[PDB]
Ligand binder design. Structure first.
Ligand SMILES: [Ca+2]
Ligand SMILES: [Ca+2]
Ligand SMILES: [Ca+2]
Ligand SMILES: [Ca+2]
Ligand SMILES: [Ca+2]
Length: 318
């Protein structure tokens, strides 16, 4: 089903690669091209072996050297590529959760698009690396029903996907209907329980049945009924239930579409997903926004930063 764009290099020689990186950084100047070309052609697991080979050979920390050598978004991108996959999302959450100014967008984006299996793994690493419990931090920086929805998601206790029970589908569609459009005000608690705990396959049927019953797509009602953080979260969960790739492909588009670029989001989605479903993200991107993810990036991004991105991305036609 899911297809990433980066895979294990076959003739991988951890030690050979390490000296190419040493050569590329020794002396004045930097051969940002050898780095960029080597690192985007190796999987994340290989990038980690390369990192330790470099240390056992030169007694130097690879990431630390590049940090001092590279500059700008190119650096930020290459630094993101070096982060172990099992730690990156935790890392991104901690930096958004550094709530002197919490970045809800990132919280909503990661928590809504990651599966329960991924949420569990993410909560694990986060505590092992930051000696903090993810939930505690979230509850600490967020308030209201937004905070509640995230904690519901954080439990990673979504029902399993079993045979759909039509009566059950009718029950839930009608319930959301009464909890929103037919109610003076909104019963957000009801939306959160259903959207946050029913299985994915079940909710897909509910969204369809809800359409038939009310004449509205759940997304429209959500926009009619809610506002702010909760709305975004609810839209993100709904969109993810329908298709994680499409949701991610959509968040990518809007990161660029406007003027300039939301480099962080562009970096996070591409890196975090390069080895999961970035190929799929690419298809749903073309399908909808009419342009290739490639062409889109290629035209928004500059220099080296643009080249590494295009290499990780790939697919001119997608
Ligand atoms: Ca140098
Ligand atoms: Ca620097
Ligand atoms: Ca209402
Ligand atoms: Ca609204
Ligand atoms: Ca632009």
């Amino acid at each position: 089903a899911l297809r990433g764009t980066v895979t294990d290099f076959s003739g991988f020689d951890g030690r050979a690669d390490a000296e190419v990186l040493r050569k590329a950084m020794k002396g004045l100047g930097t051969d940002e091209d050898s780095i960029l070309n080597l690192l985007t052609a190796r999987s994340n697991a290989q990038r980690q072996q390369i990192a330790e080979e470099f240390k056992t050979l030169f007694g130097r920390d690879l990431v630390n050297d590049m940090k001092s050598e590279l500059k700008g978004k190119f650096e930020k991108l290459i630094v993101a590529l070096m982060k172990p996959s099992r730690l990156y999302d935790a890392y991104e959450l901690k930096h958004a959760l550094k709530g002197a100014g919490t970045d809800e967008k990132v919280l909503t984006e990661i928590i809504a698009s990651r599966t329960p299996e991924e949420l569990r793994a993410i909560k694990q690493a986060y505590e092992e690396e930051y000696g903090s419990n993810l939930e505690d931090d979230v509850v600490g920086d967020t308030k209201g029903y937004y905070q509640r929805m995230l904690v519901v998601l954080l439990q990673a206790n979504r029902d399993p996907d079993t045979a759909i029970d039509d009566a059950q589908v009718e029950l839930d569609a009608q319930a959301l209907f009464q909890a929103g459009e037919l109610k003076w005000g909104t019963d957000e608690e009801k939306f959160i329980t259903i959207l946050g705990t029913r299985s994915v396959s079940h909710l897909r049927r509910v969204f369809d049945k809800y359409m038939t019953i009310s004449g509205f797509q759940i997304e429209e009602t959500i926009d009619r009924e809610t506002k702010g953080n909760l709305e975004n979260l609810l839209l993100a969960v709904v969109k993810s239930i329908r298709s994680i790739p499409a949701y991610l492909a959509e968040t990518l588009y809007y990161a660029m579409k406007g003027a300039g670029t939301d480099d962080h989001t562009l970096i996070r989605v591409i890196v975090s997903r390069s080895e999961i479903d970035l190929f799929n993200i690419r298809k749903e991107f073309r399908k909808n926004f009419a342009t290739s993810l490639y062409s889109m990036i290629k035209g928004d991004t500059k220099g080296d930063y643009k080249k590494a991105l295009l290499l990780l991305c790939g697919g001119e036609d997608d």
